[PDB]
Design a protein around this ligand. Sequence first.
Ligand SMILES: Nc1nc2c(ncn2[C@@H]2O[C@H](COP(=O)(O)OP(=O)(O)O)[C@@H](O)[C@H]2O)c(=O)[nH]1
Ligand SMILES: [Mg+2]
Length: 167
Amino acid sequence: QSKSRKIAILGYRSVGKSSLTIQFVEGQFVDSADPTIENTFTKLITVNGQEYHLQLVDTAGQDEYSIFPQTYSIDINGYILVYSVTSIKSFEVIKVIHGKLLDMVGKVQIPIMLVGNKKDLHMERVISYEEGKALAESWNAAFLESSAKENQTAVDVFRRIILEAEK
Ligand SMILES: Nc1nc2c(ncn2[C@@H]2O[C@H](COP(=O)(O)OP(=O)(O)O)[C@@H](O)[C@H]2O)c(=O)[nH]1
Ligand SMILES: [Mg+2]
């Protein structure tokens, strides 16, 4: 009766993959997490009356030199690509990640969204909302900005990838 979804969170180091996931899962903002270990969390959520059992795969990051498998995992239902609005490197990297991701998954109908994180650090922003939104638009992807300090923004991220999966 409950639907099962596996979601992978990708992105450069320090963009907030872990903090976002932990905010969503446990409702806490954390100041650090093992940068080099992949963590899998589970979380039960109800979206629009529908019960979902989530496995959230919080990858250790990737950069421009990271290897992507050459073929996809049928058991992964969506990809969240995170960058930080405070890091141009992160934003450039997320484009390379998207490229290698698309090469791995090809035409498969598995949703990919883009998330500009750390929006609370408004004095440290180097990526405009427009830049992120337009990139996502050029990918035919959903876009959101988020802050791991703000529970609703993290919830909105994971809910949106779930909604995108069933379009
Ligand atoms: N102010 C602020 N700090 C954040 C946010 N997300 C992550 N951080 C901080 O950024 C640092 C790296 O975050 P982390 O989740 O480990 O990034 P990861 O390497 O992508 O998993 C940590 O000190 C977090 O507390 C955010 O949305 N706002
Ligand atoms: Mg992490």
